Write a protein that binds this DNA or RNA. Structure first.
Ligand SMILES: [Mg+2]
Ligand SMILES: [Mg+2]
Ligand SMILES: [Mg+2]
Ligand SMILES: [Mg+2]
Ligand SMILES: [Mg+2]
Ligand SMILES: [Mg+2]
Ligand SMILES: [Mg+2]
Ligand SMILES: [Mg+2]
Ligand SMILES: [Mg+2]
Ligand SMILES: [Mg+2]
Ligand SMILES: [Mg+2]
Lengths: 101, 88, 123, 82
RNA sequence: UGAAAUGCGCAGAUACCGGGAGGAACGCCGAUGGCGAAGGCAGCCACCUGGUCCACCCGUGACGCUGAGGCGCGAAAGCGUGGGGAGCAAACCGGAUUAGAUACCCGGGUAGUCCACGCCCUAAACGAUGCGCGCUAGGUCUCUGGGUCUCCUGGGGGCCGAAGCUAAC
């Protein structure tokens, strides 16, 4: 079991009710595949530099999970089967690379 | 992927004595453990010729130890080869 | 209506320059075009269409014919690598068309499609 | 250039402020900062600029790319003037 | 295009805006860089896997180097079966230049380039310099780990050079 980070973008037209309903499903999805949501961060809505699915703005949800490697590339699939879900990108939770000054 | 803890386990099953971590006995093991691990991988992705290379070193690598051990104590030779159900 | 003298006041001015000919264009603030001229539109037939005049001169006709629909100020949009850049522009800066902005958008493939033999090396 | 060469860059030394201060290099979200490590266009700047070393840029880059896919940072933006 | 012509455009092309399908490669980073036994290898992400360098001195105890034959790997091209085929392009179709052009230039175009499995195995497959090991001034730049860290110690890449070498380079 390794940690990861799932980034997820959605539609801007959604209402607190729709989003809340999708997340609930994202979350449930994660768990169906040994995922244990450690954190989350609804930084939703930002100014995309390029229209994704023709829309110039998106919801940025970010989940950290300690999944069983063998599944990662599968969730990533089920997360991307939802219309409202525009893009998904899981990554390895890589140490800080403090750097500057 | 494994190989992080099990190791101790293999080491501890072959260490000719409390703390032995490098005797021929052990090496072979460790290396076999790796071989089996790689062999398996190689059946899935059959085109990873490179890894197929590392296979051959170890494959030869292990063999060599056995050839040394085989001449310097046939008594422990039988046992080890046999204790892994090997060669032929 | 008939042929209708439509007022636009503002729009685009796409300019395509290359080792062959220079095509200027006029459009409405929403891409839609109004009138385009070129080097071909005015006499010039051969390599004379890549002649820098091919810029201005066309880049005057684009204007003249483009001032007929109002347009007093335009947002230029350069493209391609060759000659005629800026000229087509300055051409609009004396044409009577106030120039809002000058932008470059030349499309360079992030490496896709094998170019024709004619293109391959550089240094 | 012409009689300047314009290549006279005395190993910088004490580089102004080193371009910002204390900001990770594997931040696939921290745009605010990344937006500075790109020319007028999402053109990642060279070493010549920025102010980074070996392993560093290998990362900064490996990051800016991860960013573009999230629609956070740009790949190619238009040029104003000229 | 050196000029041109074939070619494409009023069944309205080019040029601009929007949307859709598809294949292939993958900008800037990127380098005077990296990794690999060689061939060779660069969008990103995850996973499975090889090798390798360093620090610690902890374990085995000479267990080592080379390697005829054998076996496996081996750019591009080509071959077989099947798929795909955007761009490009042998052959081939025309255009033009020429004293003549089955050529350089130009407009199309098939195999091919693409993927799967199987076959071929060659190469300026070049560092044109087998592998390993020990020994013999330095300086300079650079990648990567340790360090009492802009200094010293290890691994790798370049530059200039002691002795020495070389027919010279
Ligand atoms: Mg026109
Ligand atoms: Mg590894
Ligand atoms: Mg050998
Ligand atoms: Mg081939
Ligand atoms: Mg074939
Ligand atoms: Mg065709
Ligand atoms: Mg010779
Ligand atoms: Mg130390
Ligand atoms: Mg060295
Ligand atoms: Mg020398
Ligand atoms: Mg000498």
């Amino acid at each position: 079991m390794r940690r990861y980070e799932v980034n997820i973008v959605l539609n801007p037209n959604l209402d607190q009710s729709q989003l809340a309903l999708e997340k609930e499903i994202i979350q449930r999805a994660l768990e169906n595949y040994g995922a244990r949501v450690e954190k989350v961060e609804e930084l939703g809505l930002r100014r995309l530099a390029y229209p994704i699915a023709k829309d110039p703005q998106g919801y940025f949800l970010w989940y950290q999970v300690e999944m069983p490697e063998d599944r990662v590339n599968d969730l990533a699939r089920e997360l991307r089967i939802r219309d409202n879900v525009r893009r998904v990108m899981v990554v390895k939770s890589q140490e800080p690379f403090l750097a500057n000054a | 992927p494994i190989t992080k803890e099990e190791k101790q386990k293999v080491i501890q099953e072959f260490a000719r004595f409390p703390g032995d971590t490098g005797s021929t006995e052990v090496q072979v093991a460790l290396l076999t453990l790796r071989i089996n691990r790689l062999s398996e991988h190689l059946k899935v992705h059959k085109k990873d010729h490179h890894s197929h290379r590392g296979l051959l070193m170890m494959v030869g690598q292990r063999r060599r130890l056995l050839r040394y051990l085989q001449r310097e104590d046939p008594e422990r030779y039988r046992a080890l080869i046999e204790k892994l159900g090997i060669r032929g | 209506k008939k042929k209708v003298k439509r007022q636009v006041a503002s729009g685009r001015a796409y300019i395509h320059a290359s080792y062959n000919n220079t095509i200027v264009t006029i459009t409405d603030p929403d891409g839609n075009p109004i009138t385009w001229s070129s080097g071909g539109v005015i006499g010039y037939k051969g390599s004379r269409k890549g002649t820098p005049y091919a810029a201005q001169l066309a880049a005057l006709d684009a204007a003249k014919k483009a001032m007929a629909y109002g347009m007093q100020s335009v947002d230029v949009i350069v493209r391609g690598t060759g000659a005629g850049r800026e000229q087509a522009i300055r051409a609009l800066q004396a044409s009577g068309l106030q120039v809002k902005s000058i932008v470059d958008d030349t499309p360079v493939p992030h490496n896709g499609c094998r170019p024709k033999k004619k293109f391959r090396k550089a240094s | 250039k012409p009689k300047k060469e314009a290549q006279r860059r005395p190993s910088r030394k004490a580089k102004v402020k080193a371009t910002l201060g204390e900001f990770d290099l594997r931040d696939y979200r921290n745009v605010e900062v990344l937006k500075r490590f790109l020319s007028e266009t999402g053109k990642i700047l060279p070493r010549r600029r920025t102010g980074l070393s070996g392993k560093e840029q290998r990362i900064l880059a490996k990051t800016i790319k991860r960013a573009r896919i999230l629609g956070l940072l740009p790949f190619t933006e238009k040029l104003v003037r000229k």
